[PDB]
């Protein structure tokens, strides 16, 4: 199990390079659509280690098809240049009746499967790459169906599941399904995420996917419980921190993960 | 179980409420449905006031003499809540009970905020957005990052006054490269 760190801000490159040298990360996961004006060759010459792609705003389910074809065309040079270990994207509502959602919406797993299927099949063809799709940190109801949803999406289109273990404990803390309900997906999955979470400002009893703190114990205890079906040759797990990105806090979590998945 | 007492509530059942501050009242505190709406209102809140804290001095210190009514007006004008967001709270502030305090300090902060937002969020092949004001011949330009040493850069560019000012209060055009050396003509704020 190789351990990675997410890279969304260029300003954090000195920090990623030094964690690459202490051997605290083995690969690095770029939020690739944040760098699509950085020359592909220049991007590639910044990382000695291998990389993975994470896409934030393809909007592949809801986007206009020609917009999505152009996004794919502009993103293919980056796949050719950096030759990443994997490509990953999101399943969520980004807008409603044309108006942006600043906090993404959970899709209707029952009602929306056929539109997601058709667009995931297409989106993978337009990139020429398998895409692993990330589960949502559910807050309200309906997310009990996500494990079946993701398995069916993988059987039907050949996609992968980028399983965010931390996002699954957020759903579990929000009365969603047990993290154990994902063991089937974990056994078939090769690429994973984990990050910190926090409570909502007005109610600490609901858990929010903030990626701004240290790993919580139920997060680490769920990695230990299912270490048997997460570790495989070629597997990766990306630690994600998007706020409070200081070297000491991040190193504490990257070394806590290697304490669960030693070299 | 249930995100509301006695009711299952999927996120699709709540999307019409996610940018409406008044909707918080439609579910009891303590149910997951109520918190979810709030989580998202505080997302809009922070996007406006964490970036343009000049708004918070005006009216109440929690800004919800400005925040709550603007969000109601945004829905009526069917705004997309895209990057032009900050310029639209400017347009609302123009006909507001707080129309005073419309500092050119604060109007440029809001246009700068919307230039930076375009540069961070836009996923087209363009690399630059330029904003022209009604009372000046200066431009504000938002640039997408093309290196990893710096993020998005917004610039105040001073020019001689020879090029047509935007006909409306604000005007936009986009740049396909990191070169400013032609004038296509102003287009309208994209809503």
């Amino acid at each position: 199990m190789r351990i990675g760190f997410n890279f969304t801000l260029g300003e954090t490159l000195p920090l990623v390079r030094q964690l690459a040298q202490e051997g605290a990360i083995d690969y690095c996961e770029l939020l690739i659509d944040n760098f699509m004006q950085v020359p592909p060759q220049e991007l590639a010459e910044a990382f000695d280690v291998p990389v993975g792609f994470h896409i934030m705003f393809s909007r592949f389910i809801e986007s206009d098809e020609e917009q999505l074809r152009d996004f794919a065309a502009r993103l293919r040079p980056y796949i050719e240049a950096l030759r990443p270990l994997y490509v990953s994207d999101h399943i969520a509502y980004f807008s409603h009746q044309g108006r942006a959602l600043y906090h993404l919406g959970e899709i209707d797993y029952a009602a929306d499967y056929e539109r997601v299927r058709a667009r995931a099949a297409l989106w993978q063809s337009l990139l020429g790459q398998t895409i692993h799709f990330e589960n949502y940190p559910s807050i309200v109801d309906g997310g009990h169906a996500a494990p079946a949803f993701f398995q069916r999406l993988a059987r039907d289109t050949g996609a992968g599941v980028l399983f965010d273990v931390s996002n699954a404990v957020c759903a579990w803390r929000n009365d969603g399904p047990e993290v154990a309900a994902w063991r089937g997906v974990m056994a078939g999955a090769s690429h994973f995420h984990v990050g910190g979470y926090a409570g909502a400002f007005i109610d600490e009893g609901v858990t929010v996917d903030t990626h701004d703190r240290a790993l919580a114990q139920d997060t680490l205890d769920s990695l230990r419980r299912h270490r048997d079906v997460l570790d495989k040759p070629g597997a990766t797990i990306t630690y994600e921190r998007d706020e409070n990105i200081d070297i000491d806090g991040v190193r504490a979590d990257l070394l806590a993960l290697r304490a669960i998945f030693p070299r | 179980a249930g995100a509301a007492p006695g009711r299952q509530v999927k996120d699709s059942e709540l999307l019409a409420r996610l940018a409406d501050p008044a909707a918080r009242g439609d579910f009891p505190p303590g149910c997951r449905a109520h918190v979810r709406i709030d989580i998202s209102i505080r997302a809009y809140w922070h996007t406006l006031f964490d970036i343009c804290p000049g708004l918070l001095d005006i009216a109440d210190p929690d800004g919800m003499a400005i925040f709550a009514p603007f969000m109601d007006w945004a829905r009526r004008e069917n705004l997309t809540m895209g990057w032009s967001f900050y310029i639209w709270v400017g347009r609302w502030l123009a006909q507001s009970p707080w129309r005073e305090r419309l500092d050119e300090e604060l109007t440029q902060a809001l246009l700068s905020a919307s230039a930076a937002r375009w540069a961070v969020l836009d996923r087209s092949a363009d690399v630059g957005v330029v904003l022209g004001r009604r009372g000046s011949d200066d431009w504000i330009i938002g640039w997408k990052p093309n290196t990893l040493a710096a993020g998005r850069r917004v610039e105040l560019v001073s020019l001689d006054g020879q090029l047509p000012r935007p006909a409306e209060d604000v005007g936009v055009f986009h740049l396909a490269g990191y070169e400013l050396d032609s004038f296509p003509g102003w287009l309208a704020l994209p809503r």
Binding site: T8, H103, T210, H211, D212, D242, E243 | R152, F183
Partner: peptide, 29 residues
């Protein structure tokens, strides 16, 4: 046409952590 530039200066806009930013999947804090 012909753009007569005479002065550029950067404008600070708040961002993420150390500012000058980019998108991310985490919810606001």
């Amino acid at each position: 046409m012909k753009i007569v530039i005479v002065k550029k200066v950067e404008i600070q806009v708040a961002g993420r952590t150390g500012m000058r930013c980019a998108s991310s999947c985490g919810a606001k804090s």
